């Protein structure tokens, strides 16, 4: 479509399509200002369209090129009103499919756009790239893409875009690993799959709506709900609840660890209960004399070891907030 | 559809359709008995249908709404046989898209209904008001609905329904009561989005399908997994597991603390592990003399403070089940 406005109705579009081996794109709404007039499209309905094996983009639902158009866009909202790669088109997008693409499978720009049910798979190059800023998306699936490893993304967002539901990873993807998702400025939720936390780079990731947590071990002999901060490192946990079986499996006895990472070695400091079926608490202590900056908690005591006296002592921070050293254990 | 029964064949329906500005509902099965004879519809197939900008619902798939609250319902089963908002309509419901609704975008009633793949986005009013009872709603995306706050929530369920998967939180979210989902009689599992627990009012919220999982934090200097009971208080935790970085980020050492609520003030009493790189556990104690109702666990000991002695003393409940007060540490 070249310079089509479906107006109020949203009349015009394509429902049902297949394209094989386009030299450009199978389904396109053209971008930039062509000549002194606009080629940009508005208000079109796109459902059940398919473009397989494109040389470049499979789908282009954009309206703005990488280079800026002439100022105060003709026939459209100005460049001042909406910066580059922002301008509402109000296209409706559902049920797209791409297989095998040398180029990208999917790409668009705009602001105020609403997108659902995008599927791209199998791809030699990228599954997805976006130019979008401040757009909404749902239910994106990028599987297997970059088989022959020709870009290092599989999905990219440049925006502040808010997205829910992302499922990833074929048999073998990413580039040899180098971010499935690079979108450091976008808030994305619903990221799940066999994707690694070192394949994820986003601005914020959380999913706090989930109920009571239950973890099931399959392919593992340990059960954990790990906590990881990615400013700490994306390969180092910041804490975890570990449960490891004492003795062989089926014993019915296991120890639960409340752990904190130290020195970049996980389970360096562990508070264990029922450790090797003791039925007691194995509590760590400082291997050297306790410092005054190792305790900040009123009405708590930090046990420490004194090698010199061969006795376990406690640095007690009272509810008075003052420090006093007591002898905790001596034979 | 006025008085259409597709029978066991499931004939009739709407497939491959786009509707714009209906003064009632774009695709509508008429509610209850209208006219001398029934207008209620059974066994119709709705797939790949789009309703853009309906005044009310885009898909009104009910048939038992506001008509005949009395003992007999004409051309239909009595209200004694099936309560109001319950009928075995058995419509085939998959792949439906609603956008632009001024009011509620989706509504239906019935029992034994199985609903899948419903995406309602960019609506001025609510995404769904579900008058269904004993119906299953699978793969539901309610994103950026109730953005003018006519209603009080993005999605409402009056009855008890089973919702497997949900996606909440768009680029804007509700503030008409600030409840993202108010559906206090429905049991919802798998809520996706960064929606706060206090903004979720549901009958039962639990997960039992998740495996061994890792929590990922981005844009946060802490990873928090919080344990919250909303009978206790909606906005206050009953316990939480925090992991905060020791010193600056990238250290590779982070202290994990286990917190509990006391006095209605969260993180009042905590047990810290690896507190400021000490590799020892902080053991809290009672700021006053321990009570004999505080500890009731055989083979456990509760430390307590006595100010005049300036010495730790621990009330020990022996494995004999008898209490003895021994001095834990001496000055």
What DSSP character marks residue A94? E
User: Quick check: B272 and A297 CB within 8 A?
Assistant: yes
Residue of B nearest to A218 (CA): B211
Closest by CA to A211, choosing from B187, B180, B236, is B187
Distance from CA of A232 to the nearest CA of B (A): 4
Residue B72: both structure tokens together: 């007999």
Residue with tokens 């599954």: A127
Cα dihedral A18→A22→A28→A30 (10° resolution): -160
What DSSP character marks residue A136? B
Residue of B nearest to A43 (CA): B52
Alpha-carbon A312 to chain mean position: 46
**How many Cα atoms within 13 Å fall on the side-chain side of residue B53?**
7
User: Quick check: A226 and B208 CB within 8 A?
Assistant: no
Catalytic residue among B57, B64, B76, B121: B57
Residue of B nearest to A227 (CA): B215
Residue B259: C-alpha distances to residues B77, B226, B238, B265 (Å): 56, 9, 9, 11
**Method used to obtain the model:** cryo-EM
Phi, psi of B197 (to 5 degrees): -60, -35
Q: Which of A189, A202, A316 sits opposite B312 (nearest CB)?
A: A316
Tell me how far apart the alpha carbons of residues A75 and B213 are, in angstroms, rounded to a whole number: 51
Distance from CA of B183 to the nearest CA of A (A): 14
Largest CA-CA distance found in chain A, in angstroms, rounded? 93
Tell me how far apart the alpha carbons of residues A145 and A98 are, in angstroms, rounded to a whole number: 11
User: Quick check: A314 and B329 CB within 8 A?
Assistant: yes
Catalytic residue among B11, B24, B221, B277: B24
Tell me how far apart the alpha carbons of residues B275 and A311 are, in angstroms, rounded to a whole number: 21
Answer whether B133's CB lies under 8 Å from B145's CB: no
Query: Which residues of B are less than 8 Å from A44 in CB distance?
Result: none
> Strand B45-52 to strand B13-20: parallel, antiparallel, or no bridges (unpaired)?
parallel
Residue B268: both structure tokens together: 């009042």
Tell me how far apart the alpha carbons of residues A120 and A166 are, in angstroms, rounded to a whole number: 12
Query: Which residues of A are less than 8 Å from B244 in CB distance?
Result: 238
Residue A317: both structure tokens together: 């921070």
Per the DSSP assignment, residues forming a β-bridge with A49 are: none
By annotation, the residues of A acting in catalysis are 24, 57, 60
Catalytic residue among B60, B64, B144, B182: B60
Q: Which of A86, A234, A269 to mutate to test the interface with B (most CBs of B within 10 A)?
A: A269
Residue of A nearest to B222 (CA): A229
Q: What is the DSSP string of A8-44?
A: TTT--EEES---B--SS-SEE---SEETTEE---BS-
User: Quick check: A136 and B254 CB within 8 A?
Assistant: no
Answer whether A205's CB lies under 8 Å from A188's CB: yes
Query: Which residues of A are less than 8 Å from B319 in CB distance?
Result: none
Cα dihedral B88→B93→B98→B103 (10° resolution): 10
User: Quick check: B217 and A228 CB within 8 A?
Assistant: yes
Tell me how far apart the alpha carbons of residues A254 and A223 are, in angstroms, rounded to a whole number: 11
Closest by CA to B87, choosing from B35, B30, B164, is B30
Answer whether B95's CB lies under 8 Å from B122's CB: no
Three-class secondary structure assignment of chain B:
CCCCECCCCCCCEEEEEEEECCCCCCEECCCCCCCCCCCCCECCEEEEEEEECCCCCCEECCCCCCCCCCCCCCCCCCCCCCCCCCCCCCCEECCEEEECCCCCCEEECCCCCEEEEEEEEEECCCCEEECCCCCEEEEEEEEEECCCCCCCCCEEECCCCEEEEEECCCCCCCCCCCCCEEEEEEEEEEEECCCCHHHEEEEECECCCCCCEEEEECCCCEEEEEECCCCCCCCCCCEEEEEEECCCCCCCCEEEEEEEEECCEEEEEEEEECCCCCCCECEECECCCCCCCCCCCCCEEEEEEECCCCEEEEEEECCCCCEEEECCCEC
Closest by CA to A110, choosing from A165, A169, A43, A49, is A43
Distance from CA of B227 to the nearest CA of A (A): 8
Answer whether A74's CB lies under 8 Å from A87's CB: no
Answer whether B205's CB lies under 8 Å from B219's CB: no
Residue of B nearest to A236 (CA): B252
Neighbours of A176 (CB within 10 A): 9
Tell me how far apart the alpha carbons of residues A281 and B68 are, in angstroms, rounded to a whole number: 66
Answer whether B54's CB lies under 8 Å from B22's CB: yes
Neighbours of A218 (CB within 10 A): 6
Tell me how far apart the alpha carbons of residues A75 and A130 are, in angstroms, rounded to a whole number: 24
Altogether, the residues listed in chain A come to a count of 331
Q: How far apart are the first and last CA of chain B?
A: 88
For the range A6-9, what are the long-range contacts, defined as Cβ-Cβ under 8 Å and sequence gap of 24 or more? A6/A42, A6/A43, A6/A44, A6/A45, A7/A42, A7/A43, A8/A43, A8/B20, A9/A43, A9/B20
Neighbours of B143 (CB within 10 A): 29
Cα dihedral B185→B187→B192→B193 (10° resolution): 20
Closest by CA to B228, choosing from B237, B240, B219, is B237
Answer whether B257's CB lies under 8 Å from B240's CB: no
**How many Cα atoms within 13 Å fall on the side-chain side of residue B47?**
11
User: Quick check: B279 and A291 CB within 8 A?
Assistant: no
Closest by CA to A62, choosing from A95, A40, A33, A35, is A40
Closest by CA to B145, choosing from B178, B195, B103, is B103
Distance from CA of B167 to the nearest CA of A (A): 6
Residue A165: both structure tokens together: 């539901």
Distance from CA of A220 to the nearest CA of B (A): 9
What DSSP character marks residue B290? P
Residue B146: both structure tokens together: 């109730």
Distance from CA of A270 to the nearest CA of B (A): 8
Query: Which residues of A are less than 8 Å from B250 in CB distance?
Result: 231-233
Q: Which of B273, B288, B290, B301 to mutate to test the interface with A (most CBs of A within 10 A)?
A: B273
User: Quick check: A214 and B195 CB within 8 A?
Assistant: no
User: Quick check: A303 and B283 CB within 8 A?
Assistant: yes
Phi, psi of B200 (to 5 degrees): -115, 120
Tell me how far apart the alpha carbons of residues B70 and B118 are, in angstroms, rounded to a whole number: 33
Tell me how far apart the alpha carbons of residues B162 and B197 are, in angstroms, rounded to a whole number: 19
Q: What angle do CA A219, A220, A223 make, to 5 degrees?
A: 135
Burial of B290 (0-12, 13-18, 19+ CB in 10 A): buried
Query: Which residues of B are less than 8 Å from A238 in CB distance?
Result: 217, 223, 243-245, 254, 256
User: Quick check: A211 and B207 CB within 8 A?
Assistant: yes
User: Quick check: A297 and B284 CB within 8 A?
Assistant: yes
User: Quick check: B311 and A296 CB within 8 A?
Assistant: no
Distance from CA of A70 to the nearest CA of B (A): 30
**How many Cα atoms within 13 Å fall on the side-chain side of residue B179?**
15
Residue A122: C-alpha distances to residues A24, A237, B11, B126, B238 (Å): 18, 32, 38, 37, 47
Q: Which of A223, A302, A328 sits opposite B275 (nearest CB)?
A: A302
Residue B48: both structure tokens together: 């790949």
Tell me how far apart the alpha carbons of residues B99 and B49 are, in angstroms, rounded to a whole number: 11
With H, G, I as helix, E, B as strand and everything else as coil, classify residue A116: coil
Closest by CA to B143, choosing from B182, B178, B187, B174, is B174
User: Quick check: A9 and B16 CB within 8 A?
Assistant: no
What DSSP character marks residue A96? B
Cα dihedral A248→A254→A256→A261 (10° resolution): -10
Active site residue B24: yes
Interface A-B: count of C-beta contacts within 8 A? 323
Three-class secondary structure assignment of A278-328:
CCCEECCCECCCCCCCCCCCCCEEEEEEECCCCEEEEEEECCCCCEEEEEE
> Strand A33-34 to strand A37-38: parallel, antiparallel, or no bridges (unpaired)?
antiparallel
User: Quick check: A302 and B280 CB within 8 A?
Assistant: yes
Query: For this experimental structure, what is the resolution in angstroms?
Result: 10.5
Phi, psi of B198 (to 5 degrees): -65, -20
């Amino acid at each position: 479509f070249l310079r089509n406005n479906g107006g109020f109705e949203r009349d015009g579009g394509v429902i049902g399509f297949t394209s094989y081996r386009a030299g450009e794109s199978g389904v396109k709404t053209w971008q930039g200002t062509v000549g002194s007039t606009t080629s940009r499209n508005y208000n079109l309905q796109f459902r059940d369209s398919v473009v397989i094996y494109p040389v470049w983009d499979g789908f282009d639902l954009g309206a703005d090129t990488d280079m800026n158009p002439e100022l105060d866009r003709p026939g459209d909202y100005p460049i001042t009103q909406y910066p580059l790669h922002q301008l509402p088109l109000n296209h409706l997008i559902d049920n797209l499919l791409v297989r095998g693409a040398l180029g990208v499978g999917f790409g668009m720009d705009g602001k105020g756009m609403y997108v659902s049910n995008i599927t791209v798979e199998d791809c030699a190059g990228s599954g997805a790239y976006l130019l979008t800023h401040e757009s909404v998306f749902t239910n994106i699936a990028i599987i297997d893409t970059n088989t022959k490893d020709f870009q290092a993304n599989q999905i990219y967002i440049s925006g502040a875009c808010r997205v829910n539901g992302l499922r990833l990873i074929g048999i073998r993807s990413t580039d040899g690993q180098g971010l499935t998702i690079d979108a450091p400025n976008s808030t994305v939720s619903g990221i799940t799959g066999m994707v690694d936390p070192s394949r994820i780079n986003v601005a914020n990731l959380a999913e706090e709506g989930l109920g009571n947590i239950r973890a099931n071990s399959f392919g593992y002999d340990s059960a954990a709900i790990k906590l990881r901060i990615h400013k700490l490192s994306k390969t180092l946990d910041s804490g975890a609840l570990y449960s490891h079986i004492n003795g062989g499996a089926g014993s019915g006895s296991a120890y639960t660890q409340l752990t904190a990472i130290s020195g970049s070695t996980p389970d360096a400091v562990s508070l264990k209960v029922n450790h090797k079926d003791c039925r007691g608490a194995e509590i760590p202590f400082v291997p050297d004399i306790a410092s005054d900056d190792f305790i900040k908690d009123s009405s708590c005591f930090l046990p420490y070891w004194e090698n010199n006296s061969t006795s376990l002592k406690a640095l007690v921070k009272k509810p008075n907030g003052e420090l006093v050293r007591l002898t905790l254990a001596t034979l």
